[PDB]
């Protein structure tokens, strides 16, 4: 009906448009902005196992999906942790821990130039791709 068209219009209205590519080192393909992989749970972050009340998996997603979103909207710039600490209310030890973790797997602040790597066709052939998202 008309409200469905209004919903699609308002959705594309408040939607980020991709203007710069993002590069993952292909050994850290595993993740999305909604799932926490086992590697993220067995690595240095230990917000799980309820060791305390200040750190919780909810604050883990609320910070990781803030770092990745801040980086992927402006990949030309480098993510300085002083701005992250200025934006998040988490303790410094955890902020620097999760930042070094994300930089270790090359998810943020990956030093790369696309002028020295040629293009290629992946095993997945040409098709028709869609990304399903929850309604805002």
């Amino acid at each position: 009906e008309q409200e469905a068209q209004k919903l699609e219009e308002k959705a594309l209205r408040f939607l980020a448009k991709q203007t710069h590519p993002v590069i993952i080192p292909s050994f850290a393909s595993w993740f999305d902005i909604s799932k926490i992989h086992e590697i993220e749970k067995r690595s240095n972050p230990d917000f799980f196992n309820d060791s305390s009340r200040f750190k919780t998996p909810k604050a883990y997603k609320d910070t990781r999906n803030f770092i990745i979103n801040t980086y992927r909207l402006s990949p030309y710039e480098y993510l300085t942790i002083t701005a992250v600490r200025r934006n998040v209310a988490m303790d410094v030890a955890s902020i620097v821990k999760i930042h070094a973790f994300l930089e270790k797997w090359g998810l943020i602040n990956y030093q790369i130039d696309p002028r020295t790597k040629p293009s290629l066709i992946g095993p997945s052939f040409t098709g028709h791709f869609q990304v399903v998202l929850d309604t805002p």
Binding site: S34, L73, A83, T126, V131, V132, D134, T135
Partner: protein, 108 residues
């Protein structure tokens, strides 16, 4: 009086849309070149991909999936089977498990 309570809950909403929807859709981060937009508008929890058959072109599009728009999201995901299943009439108990299974099925 309690009537003034909503009197503060109403206008406090108008101030929010005042500082966030008349400017360039949101406030600049001022620490990174990121336009901070209230999160209730963009998206959350990408549900995956759907690939169909097509001979050189590759198409990328974004679609929004939903099961029921007029049954709003609520809790009952943080309600275990120990607190409520003990003694309640089966009528609303069925309404509870209905809402809950809808809450869980909305995410595939």
């Amino acid at each position: 009086h309690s009537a003034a309570c909503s009197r503060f809950n109403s206008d406090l909403f108008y101030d929010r849309v005042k500082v966030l929807l008349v400017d360039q859709q949101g406030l600049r981060d001022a620490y990174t070149n990121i336009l901070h937009i209230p999160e209730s508008t963009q998206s959350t929890t990408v549900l995956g991909w759907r690939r169909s058959k097509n001979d050189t072109s590759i198409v990328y599009e974004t679609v929004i999936h939903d099961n029921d728009l007029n049954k709003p999201k609520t809790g009952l995901s943080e309600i275990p089977k120990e607190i409520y299943e003990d003694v309640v009439d089966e009528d609303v108990l069925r309404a509870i498990t209905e809402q809950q299974n809808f809450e869980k099925c909305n995410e595939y």
